[PDB]
Amino acid sequence: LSCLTPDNKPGKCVNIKKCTHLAEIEEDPIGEDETTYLKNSVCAGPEDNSVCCG
Predict the structure, then answer these.
(1) Cα–Cα distance, 38 to 3 (Å, whole number)
(2) Other CB atoms within 10 Å distance of the CB of residue 26
(3) How many domains does the chain have?
(4) CB 54 within 8 A of CB 5
(5) 52 forms bridges with which residues in the sheet?
(6) Burial of 51 (C-beta count, 10 Å sphere; 0-12/13-18/19+)
(7) Alpha-helical runs (H) found in 13-53
(8) Where is the Clip domain (predicted)?
(9) CA quadruple 42, 23, 31, 5: dihedral positive or negative?
(10) Contact yes or no for 7/13 (Cβ under 8 A)
(11) Which of 8, 24, 31, 53 is the most buried (most CB within 10 A)?
(12) SS3 of residue 11 by DSSP
């Protein structure tokens, strides 16, 4: 699916088990700043088992 980045840039929407960005967060430590950025890069909805990658 096509998603728009926080800056409204053309991107794609994928589950929470494929996007490289998700793998980086799972491999690296977690923080409040990472949770806020991840929530903003979601496929519309704090909970939808999906994320937006652009």
Answers:
(1) 14
(2) 10
(3) 1
(4) yes
(5) 13
(6) buried
(7) 20-27, 32-40
(8) 2-53
(9) negative
(10) no
(11) 53
(12) strand
- Report residue 6 CA to chain centroid gap: 10
Show the tokens assigned to 43: 């496929």
> Which domain CATH number covers 29?
3.30.1640.30
The domain of 6 spans 1-54
Q: Is the dihedral of CA 1, 20, 23, 35 positive or negative?
A: negative
Burial (CB < 10 A; 0-12, 13-18, 19+), residue 35, is exposed
Report how far residue 9's alpha carbon sits from residue 17's, in angstroms, rounded to the nearest whole number: 22
**Tokens at residue 15, please?**
């589950």
Residue in the structure block whose two tokens are 């937006």: 52
Cα–Cα dist 31/13, whole Å: 23
Specify the length of the chain in residues.
54
